[PDB]
Amino acid sequence: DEEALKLKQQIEAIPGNFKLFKQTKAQTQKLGAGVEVRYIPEQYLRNPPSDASLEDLMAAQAHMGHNTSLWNPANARYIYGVRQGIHIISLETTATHLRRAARVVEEVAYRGGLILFVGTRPGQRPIVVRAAELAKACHLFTKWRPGTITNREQLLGGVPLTVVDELDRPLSGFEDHLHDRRPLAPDLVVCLNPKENMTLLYECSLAKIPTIGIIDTNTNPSWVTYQIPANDDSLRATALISGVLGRAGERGQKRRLEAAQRGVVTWKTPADVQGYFELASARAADARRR
Amino acid sequence: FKLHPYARAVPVSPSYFTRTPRFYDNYLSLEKLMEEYEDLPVIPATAVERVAWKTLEDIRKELGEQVKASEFARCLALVKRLNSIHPDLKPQEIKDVLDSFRRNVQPFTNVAKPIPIDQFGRACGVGKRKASSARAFVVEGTGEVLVNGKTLAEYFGRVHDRESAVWALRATNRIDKYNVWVKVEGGGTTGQAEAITLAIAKALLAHEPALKPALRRAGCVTRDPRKVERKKHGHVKARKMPTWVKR
Amino acid sequence: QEKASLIKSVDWNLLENKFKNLNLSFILNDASYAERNNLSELLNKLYYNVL
Amino acid sequence: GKGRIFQAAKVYQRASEAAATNIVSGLPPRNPPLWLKAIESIPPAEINTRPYPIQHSPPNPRARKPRNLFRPTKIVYPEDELRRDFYRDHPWELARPRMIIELDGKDARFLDWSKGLRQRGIPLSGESVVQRQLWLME
Amino acid sequence: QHYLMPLRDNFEQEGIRNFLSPGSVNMAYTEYQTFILEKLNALVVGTDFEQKDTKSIVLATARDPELAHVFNHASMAHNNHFFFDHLSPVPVKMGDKLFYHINENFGSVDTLRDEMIGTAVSMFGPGFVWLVRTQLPGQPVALRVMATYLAGSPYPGAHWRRQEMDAQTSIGSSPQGLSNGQRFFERSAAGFKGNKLEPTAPGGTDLIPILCLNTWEYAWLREYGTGVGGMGGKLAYAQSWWNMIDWAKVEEEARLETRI
RNA sequence: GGUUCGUUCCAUGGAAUUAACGUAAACCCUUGCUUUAUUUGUAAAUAUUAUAAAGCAGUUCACCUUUAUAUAGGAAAUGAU
Ligand SMILES: [K+]
Ligand SMILES: [K+]
Ligand SMILES: [Mg+2]
Ligand SMILES: [Mg+2]
Ligand SMILES: [Mg+2]
Ligand SMILES: [Mg+2]
């Protein structure tokens, strides 16, 4: 039966009508009147804000804590009151702590530090990956493997590294170093759900690594160095907080690379690479006489 | 020649601390393409050419990572989604990344050679049993059967074995259509009888290939691989053990 | 990668699969290439020749 | 105490001390971590201290030995009494779907209840009657 | 919320030369489009249509009988702006390509003039007269004249409200009357059951409105008066309109594939 | 917590990441098929028993069922083989 032929015409007509459909769309779509678009779900990723206001935080549902019964009474310092059977986090407290964390993220990126954004909940992968992209950092959206910091030789043994200068240009002549070197640990960890991964945060406490976390009404605030009291169960509040910290890192990386063009390095060679220079000159000093 | 004064080690990939760096780097690239070419039209799955995508094992070996089946199952749903894009409208970027997920494995081909028919119209079939091997030459005839020159009754002194030797012709009701000239060797009475069953069945299919569905249900196509088990040291026979004394 | 298995696929580079008819009367008889008559021209395409 | 000892609030103090001197006595200390100077002047905030929470309602004056002093209190407004009155007289007004999803949190910037029930940005709902009632009643 | 957008060439300030006074276009667009948008806002203030566009509200509220009142304000705002958006401050010379199809389809540009103008008066009711571009998958581009009623939309995705034939003077016992009556129930029954009468292409690329003529009284009653005595009126309004058409833009939106 | 002949595989754990041995795989005999060889074995022969080197083959395909959608299982002389 030729009933499949006319169906073929449909598959052959898609390139045609599609081009025509897209053209006519740009003609009669925005004629009637203008619309004031105040919210788009994809706004926190496409164009995150540099700073969060009280209205942005409240609209993102960052003030909705957990049930009053499931509360860590230690973090009663950030709670504004009780309503709808839950604890309300003070909007002023979330804003102040968020502007402070943004400074930490900006300075660590300004001093050439390695940052790690960690959001493991289901719908947090696009958020963490976007934040790490802006700040030129690392991302983690799956279950943290216990020991990736305190036991980095086993877990991060064969992962490749590279040596770069103040302008992030790859330097040649460190082949012997990169082969015999201890794997890297993050200089800053931004956790979007501390309650769910305390193994990661405890290794940062042992390794002396500063950490930033979203502390919900039931989360222990002693697990991170810099707390951001806010609702960690909302993907709208997590995208705003993460986007604001991503802009902080981006704004810090811009200053670091601008100072480099002027010949001003905002950091010093780490101790790991520093020692390599010493023994490297020794091998040159040995051959100096011989 | 001297090294650069300012230098610091930096991870190459952004997925440095993840479980599988190389996998996520490739998975995030698909997420970026899908999010970019989501508006392009698609084609119903019925009109999508079937492709043999790689397996979870081919990826583990290729990337040298211990990828998870659940995380790979969702990475496979993207390539199937992107593959559904219209070919003409499909960008060159998606065409290339998809070619890296194709599985170009070809199974080995082993086709048996068909049994010919001699110029005199006789086809030779071969059957085997416990220790016997038969060669049956089936020809258009009246129903005369010879086994090593002797008649069917002068050779098998057990009617059960006679019916089993020519069971293929009996099941298909063709005893009076062909003449068989069998030549058996080795084995015993029942071993040779069942060996001729398979021999005539194969030779018969050379004349009328459309009888295999019937010889199947008759049980004349299957080769019975049962064989005497060897004697094993410490045993009286293949499996019989000597008397075990507890005290 | 070491503990990874191998999928059995036909290797068409093997000399056994590349020529399923090993008789020179068929290989050198203008089968695929244009005028590869000389048996040497055929061998040079298969093996590494030091000469 | 099953919990572990988290010293996250003292990463700088611990890291700065380990970097003060060199383990090989007689040599200058190596360069510290790159994050040490970044948060040099951004100390952590005080945690675990229990303050007197905001009192959204007057505390019981007759109480002589009050308990739950460090417990957050319930937020109550004069409109709560009004909302309960309206929606109890109009139960099927709850069947009209209402979108509590916020757009930008700037709804209260265009609400002038001296005009009427129809405002900008919000739909005509039982909330409009409560806000209009409260304005007239005050 | 939906806000009023400026016009093409400051018509609100100066208006058209010899088609509408600045005061008339003010009462026709500013003092009316704003009135419609105020009512449109109240209907979508707390619904999914709060941030959607006018045409998006048209196609989304076409068949739903519980949103017919929302369709009117959304379709009216889209149709009204579509009318002023195709007017030119100065007469434009009709392009060659468009000048060919009009003659091939209608016979002559002057024939198309009387057909549209004749349909505006022959309709005797506030509506819109459209110049539709129909092109089936197998057939070529063909131009025709479609006349919609109070707020009907020409787009195929909103055929549910393609109000193009009154029922009080078109459905009767006469031979032609019964035919119209049959088509009436055939549509209502087909639309209700979900069946489609005229197969259309995906994306609504079948009909592409190019030109429009707003015949509502608020656009001409003030300028051209009632029309008693043959002077002015709805007739002269349609005539003067034909001189200010933006044939340059009309030809553009038409997208007449070049085949000469 | 499921699943498997199986610490097999999947998911998961506020701690795991890996190594060796056993296991498994592979090997030997056996089963079907392909190529090679034909005496001292084979009635003849246009090559089919036997002999013995290498290679291929299965739970493969079809059907049915299928959890948390992640990993699968069942049916057994009347699907193929
Ligand atoms: K025995
Ligand atoms: K053999
Ligand atoms: Mg929570
Ligand atoms: Mg484990
Ligand atoms: Mg074993
Ligand atoms: Mg001999």
d(CA E163, CA E170): 13
Amino acid at A69: S
Residue A214 token pair: 């979203």
Contact between A58 and A49 under an 8 Å Cβ cutoff? The reply is no
- Please, how many CA atoms are within 13 Å of residue D34, restricted to the half-sphere of its CB? 31
- Residue among C2, C3, C9 with most chain B CBs within 10 A, to mutate: C9
- Please, how many CA atoms are within 13 Å of residue C42, restricted to the half-sphere of its CB? 20
Contact between E218 and A33 under an 8 Å Cβ cutoff? The reply is no
Ligand nearest to the CA of A143: 4
User: For residue A241, is it left (φ>0), alpha (ψ between -120 and 50) or beta?
Assistant: alpha
Span CA (E153) to C1' (F20), Å: 79
d(CA E197, CA B238): 81
Q: Is residue E85 less than 8 Å (CB to CB) from chain A?
A: yes
CA of A195 to the centre of ligand 3 (A): 7
Give residue B32's Cα distance to chain centre.
Answer: 41
- Report how this structure was experimentally obtained: cryo-EM
Amino acid at B12: V
**Shortest-distance nucleotide from A143 CA to C1':** F12
**Shortest-distance nucleotide from B109 CA to C1':** F56
Instruction: From chain C, pick out residues whose CB is under 8 angstroms from the CB of B107.
Output: 8-10
- Residue D82 Cα, gap to closest chain E Cα (Å): 22
This PDB structure is determined at a resolution in Å of: 2.8
Q: Which nucleotides of F are covered by protein (CB under 7 A)?
A: 9-18, 30-35, 43-44, 46, 48-50, 55-57, 69-71, 77-81
Q: Spell out where chain E has E strands.
A: 2-3, 128-134, 142-148, 211-214
User: For residue E254, is it left (φ>0), alpha (ψ between -120 and 50) or beta?
Assistant: alpha
Q: Is D24 exposed, middle or buried (0-12, 13-18, 19+ CB in 10 A)?
A: exposed
CB pairs under 8 A between A and E: 73
Q: Is D95 exposed, middle or buried (0-12, 13-18, 19+ CB in 10 A)?
A: exposed
d(CA E210, CA E131): 6
Q: Is residue C1 less than 8 Å (CB to CB) from chain B?
A: yes
d(CA E174, CA E167): 14
d(CA D31, CA D22): 10
Which 3 state secondary structure label does DSSP give A162?
strand
Q: Is residue B45 less than 8 Å (CB to CB) from chain A?
A: no
d(CA B204, CA B212): 9
Q: Do E42 and D121 touch (CB under 8 A)?
A: no
Cβ burial B77-102 (10 Å sphere, 16+ → b, else e) = ebbeebbbbeeeebeeebeebbeebe
Instruction: From chain A, pick out residues whose CB is under 8 angstroms from the CB of D71.
Output: 76
- Relative to beta strand B145-147, strand B150-151 is antiparallel
**Shortest-distance nucleotide from A219 CA to C1':** F14
Instruction: From chain D, pick out residues whose CB is under 8 angstroms from the CB of A240.
Output: none
DSSP state for residue B133 in the 8-state scheme: E
d(CA E210, CA E130): 7
Q: Do E45 and D98 touch (CB under 8 A)?
A: no
Q: What value does the CA radius of gyration of chain C take, rounded to a whole number of Å?
A: 15
d(CA B84, CA B100): 16
Span CA (B15) to C1' (F10), Å: 24
Q: Please list, in sequence order, all residues whose beta carbon lies within 8 angstroms of the beta carbon of residue B76, skipping any fewer than 6 positions away.
A: B53
Which of E92, E85, E106 is closest to E253 using CA atoms? E85
Question: Residue E213: which H helix or E strand, with range?
Answer: strand E211-214
- Please, how many CA atoms are within 13 Å of residue C26, restricted to the half-sphere of its CB? 5
Amino acid at E195: N
Contact between E246 and E92 under an 8 Å Cβ cutoff? The reply is yes
Question: Residue B154: which H helix or E strand, with range?
Answer: helix B152-155
User: For residue C30, is it left (φ>0), alpha (ψ between -120 and 50) or beta?
Assistant: left
d(CA D77, CA D131): 12
Q: Is residue D43 less than 8 Å (CB to CB) from chain A?
A: no
CA of B240 to the centre of ligand 5 (A): 24
CA angle A170, A172, A178 (to 5 degrees): 85
Phi, psi of A116 (to 5 degrees): -140, 115
d(CA A185, CA A199): 15
User: For residue C35, is it left (φ>0), alpha (ψ between -120 and 50) or beta?
Assistant: left
Q: What value does the CA radius of gyration of chain E take, rounded to a whole number of Å?
A: 19
CB pairs under 8 A between B and C: 21
d(CA A290, CA B14): 44
Phi, psi of B228 (to 5 degrees): -60, 130
Contact between B203 and B123 under an 8 Å Cβ cutoff? The reply is yes
Cβ under 8 Å to A: D residues 83-112: 102-106
Contact between A266 and A110 under an 8 Å Cβ cutoff? The reply is yes
Amino acid at D31: N
- Indicate the angle between helix axes B92-99 and B69-83, nearest 10 degrees: 140
Q: Give the residues across from E212 on adjacent strands.
A: E130
Neighbour tally for A214: CB within 10 Å:
29
CA angle D71, D76, D79 (to 5 degrees): 175
Residue B71 token pair: 């995380």
Which 3 state secondary structure label does DSSP give A166?
coil
Which 3 state secondary structure label does DSSP give A67?
strand
